Motif scaffolding. Structure first.
Motif, PDB file in Angstrom:
ATOM      1  N   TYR A 279       0.858  -1.162   0.000  1.00 17.07           N
ATOM      2  CA  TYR A 279       0.000   0.000   0.000  1.00 17.07           C
ATOM      3  C   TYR A 279       0.891   1.206   0.000  1.00 17.07           C
ATOM      4  O   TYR A 279       2.024   1.069   0.394  1.00 17.07           O
ATOM      5  CB  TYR A 279      -0.930  -0.005   1.220  1.00 17.07           C
ATOM      6  N   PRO A 280       0.406   2.370  -0.434  1.00 13.75           N
ATOM      7  CA  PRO A 280       1.252   3.526  -0.718  1.00 13.75           C
ATOM      8  C   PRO A 280       1.545   4.397   0.439  1.00 13.75           C
ATOM      9  O   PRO A 280       0.756   4.504   1.365  1.00 13.75           O
ATOM     10  CB  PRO A 280       0.384   4.337  -1.657  1.00 13.75           C
ATOM     11  N   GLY A 281       2.661   5.097   0.347  1.00 15.00           N
ATOM     12  CA  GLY A 281       3.105   5.962   1.423  1.00 15.00           C
ATOM     13  C   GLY A 281       3.300   7.382   0.949  1.00 15.00           C
ATOM     14  O   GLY A 281       2.548   7.897   0.117  1.00 15.00           O
ATOM     15  N   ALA A 282       4.352   7.992   1.462  1.00 15.45           N
ATOM     16  CA  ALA A 282       4.701   9.370   1.191  1.00 15.45           C
ATOM     17  C   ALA A 282       4.974   9.697  -0.261  1.00 15.45           C
ATOM     18  O   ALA A 282       5.375   8.863  -1.052  1.00 15.45           O
ATOM     19  CB  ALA A 282       5.950   9.722   2.009  1.00 15.45           C
ATOM     20  N   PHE A 283       4.799  10.966  -0.561  1.00  9.03           N
ATOM     21  CA  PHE A 283       5.182  11.543  -1.822  1.00  9.03           C
ATOM     22  C   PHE A 283       6.578  12.097  -1.717  1.00  9.03           C
ATOM     23  O   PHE A 283       6.978  12.568  -0.665  1.00  9.03           O
ATOM     24  CB  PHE A 283       4.245  12.706  -2.166  1.00  9.03           C
ATOM     25  N   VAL A 284       7.326  12.082  -2.811  1.00 12.26           N
ATOM     26  CA  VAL A 284       8.660  12.683  -2.778  1.00 12.26           C
ATOM     27  C   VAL A 284       8.914  13.435  -4.060  1.00 12.26           C
ATOM     28  O   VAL A 284       8.932  12.833  -5.125  1.00 12.26           O
ATOM     29  CB  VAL A 284       9.779  11.621  -2.558  1.00 12.26           C
ATOM     30  N   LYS A 285       9.107  14.743  -3.974  1.00 10.08           N
ATOM     31  CA  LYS A 285       9.299  15.536  -5.187  1.00 10.08           C
ATOM     32  C   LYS A 285      10.642  15.215  -5.849  1.00 10.08           C
ATOM     33  O   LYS A 285      11.627  15.100  -5.171  1.00 10.08           O
ATOM     34  CB  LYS A 285       9.161  17.032  -4.880  1.00 10.08           C
ATOM     35  N   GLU A 286      10.644  15.032  -7.169  1.00 10.20           N
ATOM     36  CA  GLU A 286      11.867  14.939  -7.968  1.00 10.20           C
ATOM     37  C   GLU A 286      12.540  16.334  -8.126  1.00 10.20           C
ATOM     38  O   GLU A 286      11.943  17.289  -8.647  1.00 10.20           O
ATOM     39  CB  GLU A 286      11.558  14.275  -9.328  1.00 10.20           C
TER      40      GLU A 286
ATOM     41  N   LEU B 274       1.248  17.845   1.458  1.00  8.81           N
ATOM     42  CA  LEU B 274       2.561  18.330   1.081  1.00  8.81           C
ATOM     43  C   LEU B 274       2.391  18.985  -0.265  1.00  8.81           C
ATOM     44  O   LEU B 274       2.632  20.168  -0.386  1.00  8.81           O
ATOM     45  CB  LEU B 274       3.575  17.178   1.067  1.00  8.81           C
ATOM     46  N   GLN B 275       1.906  18.253  -1.255  1.00 13.20           N
ATOM     47  CA  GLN B 275       1.697  18.846  -2.562  1.00 13.20           C
ATOM     48  C   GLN B 275       0.798  20.065  -2.543  1.00 13.20           C
ATOM     49  O   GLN B 275       0.949  20.939  -3.377  1.00 13.20           O
ATOM     50  CB  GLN B 275       1.191  17.819  -3.573  1.00 13.20           C
ATOM     51  N   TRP B 276      -0.094  20.154  -1.578  1.00 14.44           N
ATOM     52  CA  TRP B 276      -1.058  21.250  -1.560  1.00 14.44           C
ATOM     53  C   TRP B 276      -0.321  22.492  -1.164  1.00 14.44           C
ATOM     54  O   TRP B 276      -0.543  23.566  -1.699  1.00 14.44           O
ATOM     55  CB  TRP B 276      -2.204  20.951  -0.589  1.00 14.44           C
ATOM     56  N   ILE B 277       0.590  22.317  -0.234  1.00 18.95           N
ATOM     57  CA  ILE B 277       1.352  23.435   0.260  1.00 18.95           C
ATOM     58  C   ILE B 277       2.553  23.766  -0.651  1.00 18.95           C
ATOM     59  O   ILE B 277       3.171  24.810  -0.526  1.00 18.95           O
ATOM     60  CB  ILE B 277       1.741  23.140   1.734  1.00 18.95           C
ATOM     61  N   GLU B 278       2.892  22.869  -1.562  1.00 23.49           N
ATOM     62  CA  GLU B 278       3.911  23.151  -2.546  1.00 23.49           C
ATOM     63  C   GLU B 278       3.256  24.162  -3.471  1.00 23.49           C
ATOM     64  O   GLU B 278       3.798  25.225  -3.734  1.00 23.49           O
ATOM     65  CB  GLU B 278       4.315  21.869  -3.284  1.00 23.49           C
TER      66      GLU B 278
ATOM     67  N   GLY C 192      11.035  18.240  -1.629  1.00 24.18           N
ATOM     68  CA  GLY C 192      10.203  17.942  -0.478  1.00 24.18           C
ATOM     69  C   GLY C 192      10.009  16.442  -0.355  1.00 24.18           C
ATOM     70  O   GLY C 192       9.945  15.741  -1.373  1.00 24.18           O
ATOM     71  N   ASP C 193       9.921  15.967   0.892  1.00 21.76           N
ATOM     72  CA  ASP C 193       9.894  14.532   1.237  1.00 21.76           C
ATOM     73  C   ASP C 193       8.873  14.367   2.359  1.00 21.76           C
ATOM     74  O   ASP C 193       9.034  14.898   3.451  1.00 21.76           O
ATOM     75  CB  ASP C 193      11.282  14.069   1.696  1.00 21.76           C
ATOM     76  N   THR C 194       7.814  13.634   2.053  1.00 23.73           N
ATOM     77  CA  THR C 194       6.699  13.358   2.952  1.00 23.73           C
ATOM     78  C   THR C 194       6.096  14.550   3.734  1.00 23.73           C
ATOM     79  O   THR C 194       4.920  14.798   3.569  1.00 23.73           O
ATOM     80  CB  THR C 194       6.980  12.131   3.839  1.00 23.73           C
ATOM     81  N   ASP C 195       6.870  15.265   4.555  1.00 29.02           N
ATOM     82  CA  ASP C 195       6.354  16.411   5.331  1.00 29.02           C
ATOM     83  C   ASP C 195       7.142  17.702   5.171  1.00 29.02           C
ATOM     84  O   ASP C 195       6.959  18.645   5.929  1.00 29.02           O
ATOM     85  CB  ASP C 195       6.365  16.079   6.828  1.00 29.02           C
ATOM     86  N   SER C 196       8.011  17.724   4.177  1.00 30.00           N
ATOM     87  CA  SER C 196       9.105  18.682   4.108  1.00 30.00           C
ATOM     88  C   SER C 196       8.952  19.531   2.890  1.00 30.00           C
ATOM     89  O   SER C 196       8.529  19.005   1.851  1.00 30.00           O
ATOM     90  CB  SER C 196      10.420  17.931   3.939  1.00 30.00           C
ATOM     91  N   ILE C 197       9.297  20.816   3.001  1.00 30.46           N
ATOM     92  CA  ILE C 197       9.593  21.610   1.809  1.00 30.46           C
ATOM     93  C   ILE C 197      10.863  22.415   1.944  1.00 30.46           C
ATOM     94  O   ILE C 197      11.255  22.845   3.013  1.00 30.46           O
ATOM     95  CB  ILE C 197       8.421  22.510   1.306  1.00 30.46           C
ATOM     96  N   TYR C 198      11.481  22.601   0.793  1.00 30.84           N
ATOM     97  CA  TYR C 198      12.808  23.154   0.656  1.00 30.84           C
ATOM     98  C   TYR C 198      12.676  24.274  -0.375  1.00 30.84           C
ATOM     99  O   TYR C 198      12.500  24.006  -1.555  1.00 30.84           O
ATOM    100  CB  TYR C 198      13.781  22.036   0.235  1.00 30.84           C
ATOM    101  N   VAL C 199      12.723  25.516   0.102  1.00 30.46           N
ATOM    102  CA  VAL C 199      12.432  26.711  -0.680  1.00 30.46           C
ATOM    103  C   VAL C 199      13.688  27.496  -1.016  1.00 30.46           C
ATOM    104  O   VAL C 199      14.391  27.929  -0.108  1.00 30.46           O
ATOM    105  CB  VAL C 199      11.563  27.676   0.142  1.00 30.46           C
ATOM    106  N   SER C 200      13.945  27.704  -2.315  1.00 28.94           N
ATOM    107  CA  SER C 200      15.040  28.579  -2.787  1.00 28.94           C
ATOM    108  C   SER C 200      14.776  30.020  -2.430  1.00 28.94           C
ATOM    109  O   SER C 200      13.803  30.603  -2.872  1.00 28.94           O
ATOM    110  CB  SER C 200      15.247  28.494  -4.309  1.00 28.94           C
ATOM    111  N   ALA C 201      15.655  30.587  -1.629  1.00 26.60           N
ATOM    112  CA  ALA C 201      15.510  31.960  -1.173  1.00 26.60           C
ATOM    113  C   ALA C 201      16.386  32.979  -1.939  1.00 26.60           C
ATOM    114  O   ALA C 201      16.507  34.123  -1.515  1.00 26.60           O
ATOM    115  CB  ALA C 201      15.806  32.010   0.317  1.00 26.60           C
ATOM    116  N   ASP C 202      16.960  32.581  -3.072  1.00 21.88           N
ATOM    117  CA  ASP C 202      17.875  33.444  -3.817  1.00 21.88           C
ATOM    118  C   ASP C 202      17.165  34.724  -4.225  1.00 21.88           C
ATOM    119  O   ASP C 202      17.758  35.796  -4.137  1.00 21.88           O
ATOM    120  CB  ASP C 202      18.425  32.736  -5.060  1.00 21.88           C
ATOM    121  N   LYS C 203      15.901  34.611  -4.650  1.00 19.19           N
ATOM    122  CA  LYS C 203      15.147  35.767  -5.163  1.00 19.19           C
ATOM    123  C   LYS C 203      14.634  36.655  -4.028  1.00 19.19           C
ATOM    124  O   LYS C 203      14.410  37.842  -4.232  1.00 19.19           O
ATOM    125  CB  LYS C 203      13.981  35.357  -6.097  1.00 19.19           C
ATOM    126  N   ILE C 204      14.439  36.085  -2.844  1.00 23.11           N
ATOM    127  CA  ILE C 204      14.091  36.867  -1.660  1.00 23.11           C
ATOM    128  C   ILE C 204      15.276  37.692  -1.223  1.00 23.11           C
ATOM    129  O   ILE C 204      15.111  38.770  -0.694  1.00 23.11           O
ATOM    130  CB  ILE C 204      13.639  35.946  -0.508  1.00 23.11           C
TER     131      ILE C 204
END
Ligand SMILES: Nc1ccn([C@H]2C[C@H](O)[C@@H](COP(=O)(O)OP(=O)(O)OP(=O)(O)O)O2)c(=O)n1
Ligand SMILES: [Ca+2]
Ligand SMILES: [Ca+2]
Ligand SMILES: [Ca+2]
Length: 902
Positions: free
Chosen positions: A394-401, A597-601, A623-635
């Motif tokens: 059965y399926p688990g977490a999502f993981v962004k490529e 996770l995807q919703w908040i991506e 992002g991995d299951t509960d995680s997001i990793y945001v590029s702040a270069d433009k900020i």
DNA sequence: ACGGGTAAGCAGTCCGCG
DNA sequence: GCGGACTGCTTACC
């Protein structure tokens, strides 16, 4: 007598009687035998109404049983007929629940925790406990009530006669011809020499009756010490005398007999064995290249190897004074490790919370079956009969490529205790299932397009609907363990923050003689303490630093292991041996998480396009299951290297941008998702974790990703802690793997530190020096490590069979080269091994060789393997290939190009 | 029997390929 | 004579 309530120690079931050892109201240790009368239940018509309803409101009727065997032939008889037999069918737990109907508040100073290790000289090689051929020639046994180390030393044996042990000589330094036995324990050793083995054992059995352990531990005590001393006494005095190791006189020997050996586990009724090695594997969140006490000791405590000349096998004949000192140190070593990690304490807490045998803290499923059942007794409910089920993926977490690249400025965010939260938010429970709905494809929910599942129930994008109004047992019971986690985490992060204060302070080491301070490191150093620290000496600060890290490790243990338990209730719902197993609920949880996770991506991408100004540009790079990793270069560009005075300034800034603008946004996004799924309670609490970047004005690249589950980051702030010096947070890469040689882990990491902190020229310089100097590293340092499974299966006449792993092939060539003589150590099926490649036309007839980890290879063959090692291969395979991985991804070279200037 | 799924990279074999 | 696709194994990450 205005005082304390009774609390159990151990409990067992023999036939139609329960054997319990407990501590009574005047704190004395006792035993009773009880013909416990259990109750199981059955459905009855809607009319025969009463107290007991199953968890679905279906009425039930309680059944007297005369004894326990009588209630078991009933469970079998009800299956022979085919109706459900409800209630708790593990009677030790019912008994515990019936007797201890209250929150158990328990006194550890009253629980006997014994810690032992034995020594057994064998010139034959490793001394199988199932046979026990050889004399037991030393036991050390530490008792937490007495607080003494009881030493049983055998002066006479067919393998040599020896002088008594001198406690004076043990005390002295190595440097003075002594053994360096820690002096905080010299005064606690009771020493007992012996004529002969029989006399020593009989005295040890008499000692055990008077001081019978409740919790029994030590290193590797289930698979060696216990069964060896059992089988030994059994061979010499008989079963009857052997059964003395049980306060109840019952043992079990279950056979489980290797692919060819005779390994049995021995169970001693009325004792809770907590093998420290099993505690360590489960609760320490490490994966070690070897699990010898030497090894782990030096890792956890930073103490020395514990040296000696000649092989352990001839040690008692050559230096009996040390043999015994070493046995004593080994026992204390486990105590030292438990004082740091506090796994015994963990186990007690957890165990008395659920009302189970303490050795059932190795089983989340036991642990929750019991919590849940206690929680339902309370409301006169009856639990289900456990059912057979077939296993099922059965399926688990999502993981962004992620796009393999470097990432100068990154900032992460993660959800709090995700799956536990999802259960709470959605109200997922065996008994809260409302129904189903027609499920649209996953991305339709992510993109906020699909129809609202339900107007009235709480939903998951796997199609499940839960009652929103009532309380679920599972949510309820997981909330109680989560709240204890929250608190211990607090102490731990505080402790961590307090440590960085101390490290900053260590570049003002003030030339002075002082003693360290008296603070409680679980709480944020109040300002007066902070000012006091700035004036103290290294000697002093260093002692505070060490005390802080022990307070934080303490808190880590308590926190990450409640995280383990709660995340393990999630797991149990996907495991068929769990009374409440249900893939509907398991998938409701993972699928909701995929969505969350995807919703908040999608959200975070939206908001940062608005406010950064741009449009449709990727801000979430991973992002991995509960995680997001945001590029702040433009900020950052939005200011620039404008008014940023130093590395800390922009870190201060970002910390501020995340806390003041993004997490508000994020809360808005999830509140909205909760409205959409019509959940019970909003609990998607995503806050910020990491903040990464180059130092200011550096050539350093700040970060990179090679692919899924493989990134490094140079991190300045983690969960509110501001590091004194930047800390590499490397996830997935070879530096983090126990299979890769220590020396390369070190080297690969320093390379990364250079890529991230001091651009391309720094790396290539260091790389040059690793290449030249690499060849004189110690062989243990540059060997690979692998677990060693199914050796036998790939044998085929001493040689590699079809499809044989490189490392298994290694052992086979070891087994060939030590062939014959039993002197040299054997590789143990299941244990770990070191692994070196070998050059063309070596004397071993093969392209690599393997020996068991944590050891130097046999002297027999050492000097040969040292001179036939293939460093060339070593370096390409284990350093270069990996490095090319990291540098390709980040668009970088480690070796200067064909300049075109040339 | 006795928490879960996801995913990477290494090596061995078997096959296509002047 | 070697590369790639598949498979078994190990060990990381949630
Ligand atoms: N052994 C583990 C580790 C993690 N997870 C799952 C459940 C976690 O909820 C989810 C997210 O993993 P985290 O590592 O981020 O841990 P948590 O989100 O649970 O808690 P926290 O981040 O507050 O430490 O992954 C799991 O099932 N089993
Ligand atoms: Ca998390
Ligand atoms: Ca996480
Ligand atoms: Ca966090």
């Amino acid at each position: 007598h205005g005082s304390m309530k009774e609390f159990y120690l151990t409990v067992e079931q023999i036939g139609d009687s329960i054997f319990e050892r407990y501590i009574d109201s005047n704190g004395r240790e006792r035993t009773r035998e009880v013909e416990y009368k259990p109750s199981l239940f059955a459905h009855c018509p809607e009319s025969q109404a009463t107290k007991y309803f199953d968890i679905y409101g279906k009425p039930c009727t309680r059944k007297l049983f005369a004894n326990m065997r009588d209630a078991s032939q009933w469970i079998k008889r009800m299956e022979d007929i085919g109706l459900e037999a409800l209630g708790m069918d593990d009677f030790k737990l019912a008994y515990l629940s019936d007797t201890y109907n209250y929150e158990i508040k328990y006194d550890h100073t009253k629980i006997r925790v014994a810690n032992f290790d034995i020594e057994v000289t064998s010139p034959d090689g490793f001394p199988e406990p199932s046979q026990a051929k050889h004399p037991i020639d030393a036991i050390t046994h530490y008792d937490s009530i007495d607080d003494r180390f009881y030493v049983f030393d055998l002066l006479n044996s067919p393998y040599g006669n020896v002088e008594e042990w001198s406690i004076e000589i043990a005390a002295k330094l190595q440097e003075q011809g002594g053994d360096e036995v820690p002096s905080e324990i010299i005064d606690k050793i009771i020493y007992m020499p012996f004529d002969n083995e029989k006399e020593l054992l009989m005295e040890y059995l008499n000692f055990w009756q008077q001081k019978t352990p409740v919790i029994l531990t030590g290193w590797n005590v289930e698979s060696f010490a216990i069964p060896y001393v059992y089988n030994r006494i059994k061979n010499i005095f008989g079963e009857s005398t052997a059964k003395r190791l049980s306060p109840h006189r019952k043992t079990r020997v279950k056979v489980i007999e290797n692919m060819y050996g005779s390994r049995e586990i021995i169970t001693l009724f009325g004792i809770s064995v907590l093998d420290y090695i099993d505690l360590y594997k489960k609760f320490s969140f490490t994966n070690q290249p070897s699990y010898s006490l030497d090894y782990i000791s030096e890792f956890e405590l930073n103490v020395g190897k514990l040296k000696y000349d000649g092989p352990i096998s001839k040690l008692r004949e050559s230096n009996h004074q040390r043999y015994i000192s070493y046995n004593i140190i080994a026992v204390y070593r486990v105590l030292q490790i438990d004082a740091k990690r506090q796994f015994i304490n963990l186990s007690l807490d957890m165990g008395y919370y659920a009302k189970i045998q303490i050795q059932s803290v190795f089983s989340p499923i036991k642990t929750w079956d019991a919590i849940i059942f206690n929680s339902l007794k309370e409301q006169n409910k009856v639990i289900p009969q456990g059912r057979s089920h077939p296993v099922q993926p059965y399926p688990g977490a999502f993981v962004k490529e992620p796009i393999p690249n470097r990432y100068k400025y990154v900032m992460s965010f993660d959800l709090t205790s995700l799956y536990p939260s999802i259960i709470r938010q959605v109200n997922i429970s065996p008994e809260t299932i409302a129904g189903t709905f027609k499920v649209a494809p996953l991305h339709d929910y992510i993109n906020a397009v699909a129809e609202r599942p339900s107007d009235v129930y709480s939903c998951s994008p796997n199609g499940m609907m839960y009652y929103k109004d009532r309380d679920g047992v599972v949510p309820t019971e997981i909330t109680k363990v989560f709240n204890q986690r929250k608190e211990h985490k607090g102490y731990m992060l505080a402790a961590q923050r307090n440590g960085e204060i101390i490290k900053e302070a260590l570049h003002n080491p003030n030339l002075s003689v002082d003693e360290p301070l008296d603070v409680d490191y679980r709480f944020d150093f109040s300002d007066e303490i902070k000012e006091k620290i700035k004036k103290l000496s290294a000697k002093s600060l260093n002692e505070m630093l060490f005390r802080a890290q022990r307070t934080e490790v303490a808190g880590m243990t308590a926190q990450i292991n409640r995280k383990l338990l709660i995340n393990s209730l999630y797991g149990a719902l996907g495991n068929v041996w769990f009374r409440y197993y249900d893939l509907r609920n398991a998938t409701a949880i993972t699928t909701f998480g995929q969505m969350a996770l995807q919703w908040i991506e999608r959200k975070v991408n939206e908001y940062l396009n608005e406010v950064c100004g741009t449009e449709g540009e990727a801000f979430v790079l991973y992002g991995d299951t509960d995680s997001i990793y945001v590029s702040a270069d433009k900020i950052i560009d939005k200011v620039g290297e404008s008014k940023f005075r130093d590395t800390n300034h922009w870190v201060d800034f970002l910390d501020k941008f995340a806390r003041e603008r993004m997490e508000p946004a994020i809360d808005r996004g999830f509140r909205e998702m909760c409205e959409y799924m019509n959940n019970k309670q909003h609990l998607m609490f995503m806050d910020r974790e990491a903040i990464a970047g180059p130092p200011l004005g550096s050539k350093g690249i700040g970060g990179f990703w090679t692919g899924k589950k493989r990134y490094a980051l140079n991190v300045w702030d983690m969960e509110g802690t501001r590091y004194a010096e930047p800390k590499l947070k490397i996830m997935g890469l070879e530096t983090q793997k126990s299979s890769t040689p220590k020396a390369v882990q070190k080297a690969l990491k320093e390379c990364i530190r250079r890529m991230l902190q001091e651009g391309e020229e720094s790396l290539q310089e260091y790389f040059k020096e690793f290449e030249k100097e690499f060849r004189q590293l110690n062989y243990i340092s540059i060997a690979s490590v692998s677990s060693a499974n199914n050796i036998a299966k790939y044998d085929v006449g001493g040689f590699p069979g079809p499809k044989c792993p490189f490392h298994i092939r290694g052992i086979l060539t070891y087994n060939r080269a030590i062939k014959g003589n039993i002197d040299a150590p054997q590789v143990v099926e299941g244990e770990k091994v070191y692994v070196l490649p070998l050059r063309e036309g070596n004397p071993f007839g093969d392209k690599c060789i393997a020996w068991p980890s944590g050891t130097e290879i046999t002297d027999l063959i050492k000097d040969d393997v040292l001179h036939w090692m293939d460093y060339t291969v070593l370096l390409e395979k284990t350093f270069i290939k990996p490095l090319e991985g990291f540098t390709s991804a980040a668009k970088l070279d480690y070796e200067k190009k064909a300049s075109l200037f040339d």
